[PDB]
Symmetry: C5
């Protein structure tokens, strides 16, 4: 008649099979399921989530008589009775773990048990606009149901421990329904653009801006072609860095990969013409690629030196005119593309 | 009547249900719980801690008669009797393991058992001032308690194996109480600023300082615009390196990220004007961006060469005046910002 | 006579041995096996796959009488009866996990159970043309069969959750047959060349293109040998980066590794001749490596200075002729190799 | 009477409790415990070790009569009898695993069993002199002992599989005793300085040596300030690389961190003065930072050009004198510090 | 009399102890053990291998009478009978896993069971010549044998799935014998030298050759010391990269590290002497480190300029001669050293 004696009696029954007496239909109630994201992967688009629920079903066999046993509750080990296994069918690698080794059983057979579910969900989000991205990620909650025997799951409330897990920030977790009366949790994911804008977008804009004014450096004075080659080799690192944390899957892929690619060609073309124009300034034409006697003598030499100075001046100004013509065309075209490229990344 | 015979008799009872006879209230005593930090993550703000405790509860069923059995203690396997499962409810991924496979049981039912708890706590610390940061991290210790059945947990002492786990240094571990009589361990975390100051802050200050005096290099002599472009590309690496180990979550985010961001723009602007001023020195105006006969002839040539030298001197001094004006404005503004920027990071 | 009572009776039978009564031949039916790739490794050529199947066999012992028990189905725990263990014999590290802890048993002995198989397959794909690569990867599904006792596996349908897992894209998963009536799944793997072309191939082409026109820089003006050394040191990084994600196994290894290797030698050879030609321009020969009185005096000095200018001009044009001769030979040879090397990588 | 029948009889006894009949004091003999280090972490100062022991205790209950059973030994599964669990109390994450699933039991109750213990020890070593470092690391071996019941452990011999695990080399493993008769293994750890000296110390010495003679480059000729800025940006990488594998805990921290820090300031100061002296050479003062008629005319111009040459010479020599004065002061101070700094790192 | 009834009868016997009736000597036959390497570590010299064997022993108790039971084979679960645990004693972290959950038992007691063994072997290979390295790696296979009870293991055939696992290529796996009749598998490991050569040795040789030819650059023209300092920084990066993936244990350590160190010292010395000679050319001596009137006046000025030009020419030619002498000596010594070191790395 002791409460522990009552607990021992229920264990000796060994009711390790589900309560399927009533048409093999078990309504399992899961009120106040708590959601939390542990980490979100950007390259693999995988979301790791933790689900802490409070399962509550009915076990008719685990119900004693309140007259012989004057008690209203008793707690038994989880492995001595049947316990449902909640699953996340939408994602991969779902695992359910018992929060505690004991569960509460009431006098009428109702069983209270809390579980913790860790699952990895292959999240699909429109990453066309990195970093300005965000999409709803469905997380399904299901229990085994085969053929005639079905165990419907009833969800009541969802509370989310919202907070950034890194680059991604979780905004909400709402309860919705699927087509065939399937309960799933709609998780809202957003990217904090404070970090990607400063580390990737701003240096890219500043580097391209430095290239536009890099034409101010005179061709003869030097420090221009070497100045531009460092800018170009900096975008090669940007392409490798950017590609290491972004999925180039297919349609609606991140456009910043295309934007970086176009800038690399634009900077290479800018260096290409400057290198050619340097030869034009030094040589005067683009053919490298294609296959009283004493007092009068000094006057002849002095005018010859002046003519040598004059031909240097004229050959160094014709190349400047081509450089000025290209600079006007390049900066307008570059600024037009930069505004258009950025405008697509925020409003398309 | 043998002690081993007594031990085998207790195992044959199979008391795998908790001692809930007395109103289903089990006071579990946990004196001298020892705490230690294994590692602390800065980017994800996660703290890994190990908790070695000595659980001590009362099992009335596991109590023999000292007359028939003249013994005062006996040790049984942990899996043959009921053992409480201590949890860390505040954090994620809590797991309790048995230090040994045996536990001591006294003649009056008292059971002595030591457990080791490994938990991962999502620590919230004000990282606004990196590296000068530190905050108290709560670690909760709880046992299962559902509905009527409650198992209050009594804690006595906490001893911390204080010591740096890397960048973070653990200072203390004090015992406090929550609102609903919940025992939690208050952990003090501090960042050793010896490392971050030397590896990140000092090179940043020196690079900006070298930029201020980089204006001493003459525009005509060269080695200035190329000198500055290496400094600018160094801060791009600093932004990427710094962003890889700091959480850009939201309000009260690390301000060194903004401080590095401002310095990058300042160096770019300094290089931008220098390239423009170089064109002014070489060209004389900012229009590139906008769309006795023998003895007397030698005098005319000689004065012409002198005039060519004079016009070079005057155009190379007007650009110097603009460079000097900018240097006075830039170095004063830069030093004012640097002192103000650093002052916020230590006293705000 | 209760359904739960029927379930308890079947558990008490303890039928943990396989149904081998009929000639020890168990036909195990596995309809609608679902395939999905979790990740594909390029360097180690290992494919990680998840297999979700619905096993369905016959257990004659687990069949009750529908007259005494008026029920058509019942669910028992998976660990209380015998369950086949599906294997992936082709690959390493195969592990089978039960999706749920319950399985459905019909009145005639048929048992329905769904399993999840995670295996790591050593995939062999012709990676001669990176990125343009793709090959069929066999995945075998087998059940234990030793000596006389054989358990044939019957497969009906395969449905694949096709989608890129990173650099690799899964295209299909078809059901085929091996020699000895062995069922295996043919998995089609393809590499999305959008990423590898942009991050590796395009910068390589642009760098080599910049080297071809780098000969436009005059030898005397400077900024050429230093310009080329940055290009060569950039290819050293490309070799190390490319080698870190590609297997250099043997025959039909990635040819881009050889293509990068040839480009490094070609760019080095271009720098070697340019540095030698710089000495020729400055010195005039390749021997460094080998072991009225007042009015008439000024005329002698003036003609001497003119002759010094003339000898500088003639020695600076002879080196230009050798540079022009090499440039014509180098660009045609470089363009011919670049087109030929790329042509092999796409159509061989 | 069969040996297997005798083995089955001992299993049927189910003696899963410890042999505590004799005053609950069990002398457990562990001769020839073998030690081996798997890996040593330098940044976290954690040592991973493997311990292969041969446990040998006495079980009086597991002793048969040699008359009825004419056998002297028998092997039983480890899980059918009681087996002690050896622990490493000094370190974290201690786990004991059975080498085999069988153990030898003699006719008198003696049981022979070999176990493998993997533990992670928080090693404290004086890393003030990196790489020239080495200290004794204690590894404690303990068995559960609570209250009255104590199981003393007897250790006889220790044999170590000495060998380098990477940067650290294991030298010995000796058996010592603690205060309260506690057995612990003293492990000697040494750092092979062949690797750290070559990868870090030698380039640092060579870079600083190159800076000392970098003053040989003339200020006017160029190639000096740009030469020094590459040296300084190289020490920024050294600080970050060295900080990534060294614990900056507190007192007696690696002094090479400070040595690198001092060298960075020294190189920055060397570049700082050179940039200022370059302005002095070009300008002549440090004020930038602070706020017969035909035949006689040619003589006036010629002497004017000579005077312009003379003033350039005098202003280019005054700055040389300051550069020479600084070079003498800098190279003696640098060599004095370098010899003193290295002397502390080897003999302090 | 049913086959499943026979299996149930054999399971109910509970023969979980070894067949030790006959002198406690169990001959365990393991024919056709299959070997495969999963990965080989170069820095830690650890080999990961997988062993798939077919164990076959004799269990006299598990033998029925063919008259009462007209069957020749039956399959039982692996956990219901005794199964040997094969071990890899030579290496660390040995773990045996059952391929399937069923094993075949014949009418005469013979039991057939296949196991998979994963072990990590501390491989010792002579890495003096990287990448041209290769050595035989022993892998021991053993079963528990303590005191009187010995279970000899008989091996018949070894088949290896040879194939490169990365940088290392497995060549063979032959069966040999140890001193005390111990069976071990001799594994041949070879390094595919194409990848390490192309990634490390060729760039090093090209850089050294570029340094050798860089003496062609004139001292006055500039662009020489920056070239050499970039080469030296690249070689420092090479040293760090090479040290990051090679074990510097002791005697017979990789000599490529010493080769890189010597080459770095040679490059630093070349840069040092180049800077000293540049100072000598600029100054004329190594002392920086050590502590008719109108018509006649013009003639005096011109001869002064001529003398200045002549003294500049001579002070440049003396330094050119010294540079030529050092270039000859350095190129001869460097070629000799390179040939000697390559010969040592290839054939020593
Ligand atoms: C069983 O009793 C509990 C305790 O109050 C109650 O919450 C639950 O609704 C009851 N269920 C039924 C089916 O009566
Ligand atoms: C049980 O006995 C132990 C042994 O001294 C003692 O510490 C404990 O307080 C006792 N508990 C009770 C409830 O008597
Ligand atoms: C057993 O019954 C199920 C239920 O319809 C059926 O699908 C299956 O084919 C039956 N098997 C046999 C062998 O009759
Ligand atoms: C038990 O027998 C073994 C077998 O020789 C022996 O080594 C051991 O010392 C004996 N122990 C006792 C307590 O007699
Ligand atoms: C037992 O029978 C099997 C089946 O053919 C045979 O391979 C094996 O050699 C037999 N062993 C003995 C000891 O007779």
């Amino acid at each position: 008649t002791t409460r522990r004696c009552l607990a021992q009696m229920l264990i000796d029954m060994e009711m390790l099979s589900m309560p399927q007496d009533e048409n093999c239909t078990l309504p399992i109630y899961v009120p106040f399921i708590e959601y939390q994201t542990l980490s979100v992967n950007t390259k693999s688009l995988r979301l790791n989530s933790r689900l802490r629920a409070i399962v509550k079903w009915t076990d008719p066999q685990l119900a004693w008589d309140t007259s012989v046993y004057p008690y209203d509750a008793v707690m038994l080990p989880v492995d001595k009775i049947w316990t449902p296994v909640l699953q996340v069918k939408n994602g991969i690698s779902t695992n359910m773990k018992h929060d505690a080794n004991d569960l509460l059983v009431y006098s009428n057979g109702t069983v209270n048990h809390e579980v913790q579910i860790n699952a990895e969900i292959n999240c699909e989000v429109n990453l066309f606009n990195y970093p300005f991205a965000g999409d709803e990620c469905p997380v399904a909650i299901e229990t085994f149901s085969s053929g005639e025997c079905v165990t419907t799951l009833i969800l009541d409330q969802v509370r989310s421990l919202d907070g950034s897990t890194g680059d991604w920030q979780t905004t909400y977790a709402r309860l919705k329904k699927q087509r065939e009366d399937r309960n799933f949790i709609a998780v809202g994911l957003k990217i904090n653009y404070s970090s990607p804008l400063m580390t990737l977008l701003l240096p890219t804009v500043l580097i391209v801006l430095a290239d536009f004014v890099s034409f101010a450096l005179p061709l003869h004075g030097g420090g221009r072609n070497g100045f531009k080659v460092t800018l170009v080799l900096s975008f090669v690192m940007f392409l490798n860095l950017l590609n290491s944390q972004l999925p180039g899957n297919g349609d609606c892929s991140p456009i910043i990969r295309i934007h970086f690619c176009i800038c690399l060609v634009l900077l290479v073309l800018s260096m290409l013409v400057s290198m050619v124009l340097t030869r034009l300034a030094h040589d005067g034409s683009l053919a490298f690629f294609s296959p009283v006697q004493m007092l009068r003598k000094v006057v002849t030499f002095l005018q010859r030196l002046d003519d040598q100075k004059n031909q240097n001046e004229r050959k160094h100004a014709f190349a400047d005119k081509l450089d000025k013509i290209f600079f006007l065309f390049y900066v307008i075209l570059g600024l037009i593309y930069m505004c258009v490229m950025l405008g697509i990344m925020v409003a398309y």
